[PDB]
mmCIF file of C-alpha atoms in Angstrom:
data_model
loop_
_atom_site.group_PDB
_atom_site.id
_atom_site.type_symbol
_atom_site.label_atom_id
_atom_site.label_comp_id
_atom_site.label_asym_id
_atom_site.label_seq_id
_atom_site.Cartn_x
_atom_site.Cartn_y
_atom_site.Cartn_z
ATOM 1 C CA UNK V 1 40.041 16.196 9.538
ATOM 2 C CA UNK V 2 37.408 13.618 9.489
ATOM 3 C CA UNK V 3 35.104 15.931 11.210
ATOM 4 C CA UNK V 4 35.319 18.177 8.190
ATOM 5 C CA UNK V 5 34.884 15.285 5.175
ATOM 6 C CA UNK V 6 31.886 13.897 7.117
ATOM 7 C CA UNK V 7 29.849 17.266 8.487
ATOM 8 C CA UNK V 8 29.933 17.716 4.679
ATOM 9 C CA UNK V 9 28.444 14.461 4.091
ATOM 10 C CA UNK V 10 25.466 14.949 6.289
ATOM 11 C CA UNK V 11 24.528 18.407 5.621
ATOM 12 C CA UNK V 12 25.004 17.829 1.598
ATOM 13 C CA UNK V 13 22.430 15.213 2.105
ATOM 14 C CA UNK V 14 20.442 16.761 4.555
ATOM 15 C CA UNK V 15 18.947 19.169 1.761
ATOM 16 C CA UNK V 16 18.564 16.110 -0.308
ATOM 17 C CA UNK V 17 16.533 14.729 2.920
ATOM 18 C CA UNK V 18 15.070 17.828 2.614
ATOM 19 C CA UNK V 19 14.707 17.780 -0.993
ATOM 20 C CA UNK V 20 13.189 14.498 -0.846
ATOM 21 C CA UNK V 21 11.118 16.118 1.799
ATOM 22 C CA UNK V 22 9.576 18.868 -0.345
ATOM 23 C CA UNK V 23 9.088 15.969 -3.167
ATOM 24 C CA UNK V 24 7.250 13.536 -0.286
ATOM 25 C CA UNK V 25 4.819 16.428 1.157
ATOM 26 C CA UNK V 26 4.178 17.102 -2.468
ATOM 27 C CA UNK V 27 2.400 13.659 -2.169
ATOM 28 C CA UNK V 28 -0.635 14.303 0.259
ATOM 29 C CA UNK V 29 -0.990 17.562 -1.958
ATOM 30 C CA UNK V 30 -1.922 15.021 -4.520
ATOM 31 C CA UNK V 31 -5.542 13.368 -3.776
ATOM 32 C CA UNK V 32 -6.274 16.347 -1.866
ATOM 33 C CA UNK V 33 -6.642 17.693 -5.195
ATOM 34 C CA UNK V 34 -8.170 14.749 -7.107
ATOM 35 C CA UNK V 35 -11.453 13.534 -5.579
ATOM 36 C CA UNK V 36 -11.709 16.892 -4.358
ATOM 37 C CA UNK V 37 -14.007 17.149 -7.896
ATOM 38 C CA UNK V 38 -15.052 14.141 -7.906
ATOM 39 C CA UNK V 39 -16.824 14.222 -4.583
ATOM 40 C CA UNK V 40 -19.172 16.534 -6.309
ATOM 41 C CA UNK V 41 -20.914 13.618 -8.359
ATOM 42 C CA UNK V 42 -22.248 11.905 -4.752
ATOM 43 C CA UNK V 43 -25.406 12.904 -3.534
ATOM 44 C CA UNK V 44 -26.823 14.580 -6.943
ATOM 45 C CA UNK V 45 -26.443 11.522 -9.709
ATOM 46 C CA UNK E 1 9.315 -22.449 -12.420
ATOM 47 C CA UNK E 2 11.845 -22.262 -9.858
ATOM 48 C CA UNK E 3 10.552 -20.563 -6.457
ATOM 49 C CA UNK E 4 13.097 -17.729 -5.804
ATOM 50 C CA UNK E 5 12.991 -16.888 -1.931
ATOM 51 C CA UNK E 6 14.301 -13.470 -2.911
ATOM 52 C CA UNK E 7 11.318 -12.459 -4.565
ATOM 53 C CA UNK E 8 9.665 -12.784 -1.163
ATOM 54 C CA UNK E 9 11.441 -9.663 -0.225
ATOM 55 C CA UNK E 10 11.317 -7.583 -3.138
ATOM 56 C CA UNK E 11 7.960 -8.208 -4.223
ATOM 57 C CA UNK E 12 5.928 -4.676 -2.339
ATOM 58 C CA UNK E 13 3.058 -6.538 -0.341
ATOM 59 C CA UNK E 14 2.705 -7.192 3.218
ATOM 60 C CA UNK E 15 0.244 -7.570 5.884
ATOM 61 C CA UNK E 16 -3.129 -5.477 6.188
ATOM 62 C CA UNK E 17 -6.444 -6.025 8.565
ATOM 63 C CA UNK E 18 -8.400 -6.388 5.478
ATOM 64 C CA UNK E 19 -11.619 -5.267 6.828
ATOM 65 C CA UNK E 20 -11.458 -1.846 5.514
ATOM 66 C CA UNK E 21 -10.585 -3.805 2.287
ATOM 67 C CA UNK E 22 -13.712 -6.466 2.654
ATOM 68 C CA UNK E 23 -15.847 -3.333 1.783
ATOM 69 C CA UNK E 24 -13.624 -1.680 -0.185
ATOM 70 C CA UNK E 25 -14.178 -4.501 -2.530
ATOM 71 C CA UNK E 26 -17.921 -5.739 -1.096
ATOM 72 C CA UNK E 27 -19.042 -1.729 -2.576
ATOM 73 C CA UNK E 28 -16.910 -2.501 -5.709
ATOM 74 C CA UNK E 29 -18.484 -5.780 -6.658
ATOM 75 C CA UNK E 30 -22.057 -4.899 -5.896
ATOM 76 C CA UNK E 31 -22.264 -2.847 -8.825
ATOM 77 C CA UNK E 32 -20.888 -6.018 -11.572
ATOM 78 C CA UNK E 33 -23.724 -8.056 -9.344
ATOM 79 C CA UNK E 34 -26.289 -5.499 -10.314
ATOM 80 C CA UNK E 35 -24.979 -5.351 -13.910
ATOM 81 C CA UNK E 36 -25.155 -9.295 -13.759
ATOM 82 C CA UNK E 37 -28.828 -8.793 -12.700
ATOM 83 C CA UNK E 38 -9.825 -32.522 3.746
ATOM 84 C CA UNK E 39 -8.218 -29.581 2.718
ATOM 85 C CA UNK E 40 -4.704 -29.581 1.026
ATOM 86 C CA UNK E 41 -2.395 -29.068 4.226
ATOM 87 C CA UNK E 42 -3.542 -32.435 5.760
ATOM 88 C CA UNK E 43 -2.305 -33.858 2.036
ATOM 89 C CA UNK E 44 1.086 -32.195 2.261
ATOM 90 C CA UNK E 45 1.920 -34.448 5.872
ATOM 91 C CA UNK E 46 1.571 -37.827 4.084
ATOM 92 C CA UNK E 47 3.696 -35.812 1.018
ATOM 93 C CA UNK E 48 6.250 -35.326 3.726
ATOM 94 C CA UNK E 49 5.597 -38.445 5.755
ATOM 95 C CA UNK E 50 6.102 -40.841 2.654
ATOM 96 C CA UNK E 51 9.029 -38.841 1.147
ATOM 97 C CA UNK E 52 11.241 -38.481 4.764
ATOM 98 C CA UNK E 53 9.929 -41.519 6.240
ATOM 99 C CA UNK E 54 8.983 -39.178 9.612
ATOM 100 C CA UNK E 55 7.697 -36.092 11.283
ATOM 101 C CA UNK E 56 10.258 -33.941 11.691
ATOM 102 C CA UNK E 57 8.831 -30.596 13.140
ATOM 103 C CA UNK E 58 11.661 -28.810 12.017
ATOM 104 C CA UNK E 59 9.860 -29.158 8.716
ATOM 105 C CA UNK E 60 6.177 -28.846 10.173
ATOM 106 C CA UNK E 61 6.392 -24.633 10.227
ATOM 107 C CA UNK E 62 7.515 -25.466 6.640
ATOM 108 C CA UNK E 63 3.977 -26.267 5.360
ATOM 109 C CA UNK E 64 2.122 -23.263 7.689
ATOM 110 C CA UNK E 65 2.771 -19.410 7.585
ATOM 111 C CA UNK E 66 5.908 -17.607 6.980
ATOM 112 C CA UNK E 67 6.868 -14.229 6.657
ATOM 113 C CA UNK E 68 10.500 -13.027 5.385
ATOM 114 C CA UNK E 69 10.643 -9.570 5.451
ATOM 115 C CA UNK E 70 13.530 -7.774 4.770
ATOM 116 C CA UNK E 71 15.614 -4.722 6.979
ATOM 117 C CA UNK E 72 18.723 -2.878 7.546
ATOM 118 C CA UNK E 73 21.515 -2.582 9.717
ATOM 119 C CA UNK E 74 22.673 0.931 10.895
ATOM 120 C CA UNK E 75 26.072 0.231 12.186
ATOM 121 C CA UNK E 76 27.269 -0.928 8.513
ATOM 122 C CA UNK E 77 24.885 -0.318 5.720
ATOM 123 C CA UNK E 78 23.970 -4.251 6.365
ATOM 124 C CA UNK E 79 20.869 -6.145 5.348
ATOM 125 C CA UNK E 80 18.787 -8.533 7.771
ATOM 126 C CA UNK E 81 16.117 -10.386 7.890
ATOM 127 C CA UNK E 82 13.393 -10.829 10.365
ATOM 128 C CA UNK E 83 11.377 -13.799 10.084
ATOM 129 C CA UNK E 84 7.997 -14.647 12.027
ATOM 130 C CA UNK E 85 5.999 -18.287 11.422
ATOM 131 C CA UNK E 86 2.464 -18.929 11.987
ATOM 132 C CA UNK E 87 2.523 -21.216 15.416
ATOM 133 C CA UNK E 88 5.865 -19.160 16.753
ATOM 134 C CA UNK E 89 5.140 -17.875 20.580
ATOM 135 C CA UNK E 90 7.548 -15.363 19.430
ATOM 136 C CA UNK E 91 7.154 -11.997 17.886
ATOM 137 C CA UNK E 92 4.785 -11.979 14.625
ATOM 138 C CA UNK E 93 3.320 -15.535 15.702
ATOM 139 C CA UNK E 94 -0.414 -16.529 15.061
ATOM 140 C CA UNK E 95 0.047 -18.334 18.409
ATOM 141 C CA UNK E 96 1.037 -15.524 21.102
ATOM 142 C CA UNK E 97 0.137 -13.400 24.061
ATOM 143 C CA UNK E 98 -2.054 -10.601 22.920
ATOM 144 C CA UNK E 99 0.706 -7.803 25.253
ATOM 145 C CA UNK E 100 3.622 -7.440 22.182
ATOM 146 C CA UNK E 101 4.752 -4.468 21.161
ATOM 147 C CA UNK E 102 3.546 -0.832 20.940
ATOM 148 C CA UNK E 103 4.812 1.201 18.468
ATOM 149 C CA UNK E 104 3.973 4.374 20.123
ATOM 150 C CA UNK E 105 7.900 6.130 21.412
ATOM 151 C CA UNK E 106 8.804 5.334 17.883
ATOM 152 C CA UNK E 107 6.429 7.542 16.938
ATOM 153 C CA UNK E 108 5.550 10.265 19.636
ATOM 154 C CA UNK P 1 -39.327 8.394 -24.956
ATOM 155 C CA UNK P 2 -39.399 11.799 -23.124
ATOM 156 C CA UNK P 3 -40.555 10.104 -19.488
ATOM 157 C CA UNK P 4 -38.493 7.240 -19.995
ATOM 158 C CA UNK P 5 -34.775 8.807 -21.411
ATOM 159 C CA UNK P 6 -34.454 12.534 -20.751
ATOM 160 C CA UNK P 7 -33.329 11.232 -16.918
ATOM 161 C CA UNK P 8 -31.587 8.492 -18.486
ATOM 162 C CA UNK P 9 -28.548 10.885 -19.668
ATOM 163 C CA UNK P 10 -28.382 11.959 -15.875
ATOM 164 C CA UNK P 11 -27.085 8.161 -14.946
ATOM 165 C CA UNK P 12 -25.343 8.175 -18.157
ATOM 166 C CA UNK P 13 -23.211 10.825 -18.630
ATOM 167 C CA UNK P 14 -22.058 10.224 -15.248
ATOM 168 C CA UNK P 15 -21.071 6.925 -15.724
ATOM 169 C CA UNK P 16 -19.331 7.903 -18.861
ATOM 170 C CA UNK P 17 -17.239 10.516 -16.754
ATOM 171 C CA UNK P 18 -16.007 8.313 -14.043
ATOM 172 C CA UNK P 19 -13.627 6.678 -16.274
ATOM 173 C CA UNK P 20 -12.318 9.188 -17.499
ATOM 174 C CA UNK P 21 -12.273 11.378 -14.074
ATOM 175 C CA UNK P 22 -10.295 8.669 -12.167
ATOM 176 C CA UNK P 23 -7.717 7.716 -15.100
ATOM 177 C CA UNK P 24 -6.529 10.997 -14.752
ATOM 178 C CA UNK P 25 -6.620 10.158 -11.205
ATOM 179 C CA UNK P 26 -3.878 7.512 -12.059
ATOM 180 C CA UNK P 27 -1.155 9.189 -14.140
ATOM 181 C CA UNK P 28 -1.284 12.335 -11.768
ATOM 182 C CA UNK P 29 -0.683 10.092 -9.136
ATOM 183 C CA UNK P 30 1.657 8.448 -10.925
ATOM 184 C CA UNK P 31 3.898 11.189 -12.415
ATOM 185 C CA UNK P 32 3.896 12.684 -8.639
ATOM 186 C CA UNK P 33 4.924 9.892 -6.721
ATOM 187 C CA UNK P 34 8.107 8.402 -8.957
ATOM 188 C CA UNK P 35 9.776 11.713 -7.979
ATOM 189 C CA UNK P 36 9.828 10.884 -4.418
ATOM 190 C CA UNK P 37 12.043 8.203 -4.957
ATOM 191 C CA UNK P 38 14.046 8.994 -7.602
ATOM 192 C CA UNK P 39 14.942 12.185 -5.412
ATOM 193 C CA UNK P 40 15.742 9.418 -2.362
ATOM 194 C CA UNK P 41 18.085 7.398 -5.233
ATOM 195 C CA UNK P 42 19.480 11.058 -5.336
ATOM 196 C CA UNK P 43 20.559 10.698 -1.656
ATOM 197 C CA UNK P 44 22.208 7.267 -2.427
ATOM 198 C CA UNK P 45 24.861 8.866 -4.444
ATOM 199 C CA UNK P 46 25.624 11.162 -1.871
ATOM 200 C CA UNK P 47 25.549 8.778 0.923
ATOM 201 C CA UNK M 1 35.706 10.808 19.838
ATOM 202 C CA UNK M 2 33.606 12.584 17.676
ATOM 203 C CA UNK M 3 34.377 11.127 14.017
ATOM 204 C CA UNK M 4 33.297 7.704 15.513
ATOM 205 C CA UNK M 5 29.941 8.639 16.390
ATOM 206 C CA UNK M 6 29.792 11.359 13.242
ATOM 207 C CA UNK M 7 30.668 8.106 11.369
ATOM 208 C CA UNK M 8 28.219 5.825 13.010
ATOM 209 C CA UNK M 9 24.936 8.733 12.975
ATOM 210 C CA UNK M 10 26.293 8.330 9.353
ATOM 211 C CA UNK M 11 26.253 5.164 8.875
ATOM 212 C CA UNK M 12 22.387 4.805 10.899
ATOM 213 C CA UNK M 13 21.291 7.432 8.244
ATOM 214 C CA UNK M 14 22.901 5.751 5.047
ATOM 215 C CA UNK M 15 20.791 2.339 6.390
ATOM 216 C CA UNK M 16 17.801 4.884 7.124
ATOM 217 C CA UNK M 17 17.520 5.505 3.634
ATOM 218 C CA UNK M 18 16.631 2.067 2.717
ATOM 219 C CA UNK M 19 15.134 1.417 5.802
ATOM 220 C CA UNK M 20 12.618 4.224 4.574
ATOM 221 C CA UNK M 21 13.123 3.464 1.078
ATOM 222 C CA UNK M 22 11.304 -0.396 1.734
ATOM 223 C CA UNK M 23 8.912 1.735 3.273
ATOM 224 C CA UNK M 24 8.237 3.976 0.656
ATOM 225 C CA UNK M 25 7.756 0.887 -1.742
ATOM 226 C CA UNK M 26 4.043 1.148 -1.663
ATOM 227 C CA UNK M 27 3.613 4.656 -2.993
ATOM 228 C CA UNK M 28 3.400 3.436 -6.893
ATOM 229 C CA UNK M 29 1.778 0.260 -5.107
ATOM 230 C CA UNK M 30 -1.595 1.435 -2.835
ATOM 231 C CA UNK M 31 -3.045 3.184 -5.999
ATOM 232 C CA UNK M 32 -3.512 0.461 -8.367
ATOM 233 C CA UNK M 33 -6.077 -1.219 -6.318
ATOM 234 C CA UNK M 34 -8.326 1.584 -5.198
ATOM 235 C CA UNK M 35 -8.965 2.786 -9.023
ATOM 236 C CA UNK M 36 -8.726 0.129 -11.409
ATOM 237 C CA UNK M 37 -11.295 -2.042 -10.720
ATOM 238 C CA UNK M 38 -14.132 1.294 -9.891
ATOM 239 C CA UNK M 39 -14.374 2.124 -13.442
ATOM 240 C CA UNK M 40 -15.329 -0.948 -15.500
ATOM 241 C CA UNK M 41 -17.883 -1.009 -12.796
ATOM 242 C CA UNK M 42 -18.901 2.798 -14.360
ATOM 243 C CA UNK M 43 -18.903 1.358 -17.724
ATOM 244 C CA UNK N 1 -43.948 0.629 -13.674
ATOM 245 C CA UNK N 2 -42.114 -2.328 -11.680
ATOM 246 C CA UNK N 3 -40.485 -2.846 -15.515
ATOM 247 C CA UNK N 4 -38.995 0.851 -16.142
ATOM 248 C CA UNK N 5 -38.464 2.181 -12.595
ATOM 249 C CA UNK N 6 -37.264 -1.413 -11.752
ATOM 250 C CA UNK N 7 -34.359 -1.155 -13.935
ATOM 251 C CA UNK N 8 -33.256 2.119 -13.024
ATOM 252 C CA UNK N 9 -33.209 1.041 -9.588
ATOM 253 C CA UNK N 10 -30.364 -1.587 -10.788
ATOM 254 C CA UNK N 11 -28.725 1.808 -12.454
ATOM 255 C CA UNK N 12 -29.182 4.277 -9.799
ATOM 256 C CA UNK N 13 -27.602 2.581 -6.939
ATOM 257 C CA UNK N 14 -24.833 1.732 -9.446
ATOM 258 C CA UNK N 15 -23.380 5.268 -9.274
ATOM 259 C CA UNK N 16 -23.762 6.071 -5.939
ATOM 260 C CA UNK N 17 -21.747 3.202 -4.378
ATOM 261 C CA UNK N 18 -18.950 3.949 -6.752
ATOM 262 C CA UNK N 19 -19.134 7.178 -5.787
ATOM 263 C CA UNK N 20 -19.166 6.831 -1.640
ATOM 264 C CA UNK N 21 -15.694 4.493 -1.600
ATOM 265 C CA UNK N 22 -13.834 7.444 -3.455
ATOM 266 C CA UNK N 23 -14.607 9.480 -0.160
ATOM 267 C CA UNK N 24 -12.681 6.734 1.844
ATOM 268 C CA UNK N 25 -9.064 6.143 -0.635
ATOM 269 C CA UNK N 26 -8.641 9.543 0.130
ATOM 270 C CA UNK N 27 -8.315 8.728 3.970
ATOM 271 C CA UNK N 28 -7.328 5.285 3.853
ATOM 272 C CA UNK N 29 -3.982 6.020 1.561
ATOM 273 C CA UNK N 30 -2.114 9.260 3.281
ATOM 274 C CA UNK N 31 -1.947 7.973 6.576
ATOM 275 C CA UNK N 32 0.498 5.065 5.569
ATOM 276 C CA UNK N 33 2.290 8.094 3.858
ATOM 277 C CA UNK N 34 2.065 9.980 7.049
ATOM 278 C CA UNK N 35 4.205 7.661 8.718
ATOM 279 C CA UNK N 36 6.504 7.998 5.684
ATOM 280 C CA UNK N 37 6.602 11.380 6.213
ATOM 281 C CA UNK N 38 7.192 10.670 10.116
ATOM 282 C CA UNK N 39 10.045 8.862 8.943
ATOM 283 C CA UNK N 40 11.752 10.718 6.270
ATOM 284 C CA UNK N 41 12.070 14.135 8.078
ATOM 285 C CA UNK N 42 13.122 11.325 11.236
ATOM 286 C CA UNK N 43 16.294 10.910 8.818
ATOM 287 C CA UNK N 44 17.663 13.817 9.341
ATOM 288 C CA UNK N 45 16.398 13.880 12.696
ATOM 289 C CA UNK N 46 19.020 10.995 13.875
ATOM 290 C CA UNK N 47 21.216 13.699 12.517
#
């Protein structure tokens, strides 16, 4: 019966692994975005 | 002010070559400059040598470089700590063989 | 006047910009990366 | 046999957390120092 | 000329030094988060 409390356990987590997955790939998303613009002030001013 | 060894841990800053942040910070001053236009270790021995009386090189790595970083333990939810000094021939030592460790199956 | 400051507003506005182009640098990176973690102290009460 | 080592994969991912958590301790940190002091050099 | 060029010359390299290290906090800042995302999905990867 143990085999049933702790499957649950994992997999329960495992989409919060997962959910704290699709929250940490969300990350390099971020200056990706950012300087993206801001690389356009370089070579003109 | 007390000096809490805890702090050591919890506190997020660790190592870094510092070279790519030499002129991270050698392109960030330049600009303010264009706007604009015995040491102490060799005093802490006789602190130790008048107050014990003696060497005591259990107390010499003391006075140089230590590290206390902090880890877990997967067999019980534990906490550890692995510690490297500045003159250890050991692991994270200032003083050892330049063949350590490769963190390379840990991350192919 | 004319030779002298209508190039001056070229180095100016752009350093007027900056500060305000990379503080919005700072809150977007910092209402983007608290989630991470608060979704890992999510994991803590399940585990 | 099993619950033992579905306990202890457990238990290695429960320490993982924090393990990865530590890690993940610099993500509010390694921003601070690569804007802040750029733009009183732009004013 | 060595009076109003000269202090542009203070004002134009002031920009475009600011400017260059903003190309390399991009780089220099994901792949320690790399490795955290090595080592998150490697979570659930010991399971």
């Amino acid at each position: 019966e143990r085999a049933a409390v702790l499957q649950a356990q994992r997999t329960a987590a495992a989409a919060a692994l997962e959910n704290a997955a699709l929250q940490a790939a969300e990350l390099p998303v971020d200056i990706e975005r950012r300087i993206r613009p801001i690389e356009q002030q370089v070579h003109h001013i | 002010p007390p000096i809490s060894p805890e702090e050591q841990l919890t506190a997020p800053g660790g190592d870094t070559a510092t070279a790519e942040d030499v002129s991270i910070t050698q392109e960030n001053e330049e600009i303010l400059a264009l706007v604009q236009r015995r040491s102490l270790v060799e005093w802490l021995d006789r602190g130790w040598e008048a107050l014990a009386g003696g060497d005591r090189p259990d107390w010499l790595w003391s006075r140089r470089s230590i590290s206390v970083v902090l880890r877990h333990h997967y067999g019980t939810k534990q906490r550890f700590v692995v510690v490297s000094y500045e003159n250890s021939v050991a692991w994270g030592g200032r003083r050892a063989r330049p063949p350590r460790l490769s963190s390379e199956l840990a991350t192919a | 006047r004319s030779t002298g400051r209508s190039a001056l507003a070229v180095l100016i506005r752009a350093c007027r910009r900056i500060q305000q182009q990379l503080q919005r640098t700072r809150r977007a990176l910092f209402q983007r990366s608290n989630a991470v973690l608060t979704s890992l102290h999510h994991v803590r009460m399940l585990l």
